[PDB]
Design a protein around this ligand. Structure first.
Ligand SMILES: c1ccc2c(-c3cnn4cc(-c5ccc(N6CCNCC6)cc5)cnc34)ccnc2c1
Length: 288
């Protein structure tokens, strides 16, 4: 309830606002303070968390949503994960096979839980999945954060709800059909397929940091070789759509069974034809 929270340190900041480590009732909590340029992401994330009832070990736990003064500020208050995002974590550690699979299996679980219509829930597509939007919990599982762009669908009414956030997704992770603008925006499956695309890119990021035969790759973001920091639409269009480039597989992965499997899963997330891509549920089944 925002007025009982002591802000301690900023652990994240971008055009969209800031995330703070705060103290609430003796526990670390995370406080996302939205920029005035991103108020509608606050609206959407608040909408999801207390109309849809997301409770799942692999989706960031919600505490509260509030307006407050500091001067009007929109606050989203969630669980704090001290290990930070998957993006930070992969830079500061290498993985063994067990902790690599635990990460990727938990992401797949959370994404499948979102995607599946059910104390039920509509089907949800995320639309901004990336290593920076995934937290690492102390038990080594991850959870998915940031529902500001989420879209919903119900089979009982066949109503698709896309909100009206003008926010654009992270360009680095956009699926080819997004970059060439042929995605069919009124069809809910279109959005599940872009989540799968982005999930393959994250899978690639994690796998690089798994040690096999005593070697490992450096952490890199997807497409690190071919686009600058902060690529434009046209930058990403040229790589993914025109040149049809996909992240390269390290040769050493084909000498390890687990990384060979993950390489195959990634492949099947990067089909140009979105309807060929695996589903979250099928990915999670393979990973067990
Ligand atoms: C997207 C991503 C996250 C959130 C979060 C969020 C929830 N918990 N959390 C923790 C951090 C964080 C903690 C510690 C560190 N360091 C110590 C470990 N090594 C790296 C530096 C870095 C980062 C950042 N954001 C969050 C809350 C609400 N919306 C989000 C949307």
């Amino acid at each position: 309830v925002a007025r009982q929270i002591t802000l301690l340190e900023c652990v994240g900041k971008g055009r969209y606002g800031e995330v703070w480590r705060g103290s609430w009732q003796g526990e670390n909590v995370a406080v996302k303070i939205f920029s005035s340029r991103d108020e509608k992401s606050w609206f959407r994330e608040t909408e999801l968390y207390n109309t849809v009832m997301l409770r799942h070990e692999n989706i960031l736990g919600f505490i509260a949503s509030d307006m407050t003064s500091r001067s009007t500020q929109l606050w989203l208050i969630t669980h704090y994960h001290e290990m930070g995002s998957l993006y930070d974590y992969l830079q500061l550690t290498t993985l063994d096979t067990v902790s690599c699979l635990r990460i990727v299996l938990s992401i797949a679980s959370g994404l499948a839980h979102l995607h599946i219509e059910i104390q039920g829930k509509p089907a949800i597509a995320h639309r901004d999945l990336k290593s920076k939007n995934i937290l690492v919990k102390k038990n080594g599982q991850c959870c998915i954060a940031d529902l500001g762009l989420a879209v919903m669908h119900s089979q009982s009414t066949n109503q698709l709800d896309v909100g009206n956030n003008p926010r654009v997704g992270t360009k680095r992770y956009m699926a080819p059909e997004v970059l060439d603008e042929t995605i069919q925006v009124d069809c809910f499956d279109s959005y599940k397929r872009v989540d799968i695309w982005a999930f393959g890119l994250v899978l690639w990021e994690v796998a690089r940091r798994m040690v096999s035969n005593g070697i490992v790759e450096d952490y890199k973001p997807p497409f690190y070789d071919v686009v600058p920091n902060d690529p434009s639409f046209e930058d990403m269009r040229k790589v993914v759509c025109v040149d049809q480039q996909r992240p390269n597989i390290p040769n050493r992965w084909f000498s390890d069974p687990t990384l060979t499997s993950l390489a195959k899963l990634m492949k099947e997330c990067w089909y140009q034809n979105p309807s060929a891509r695996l589903t979250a549920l099928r990915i999670a089944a393979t990973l067990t």
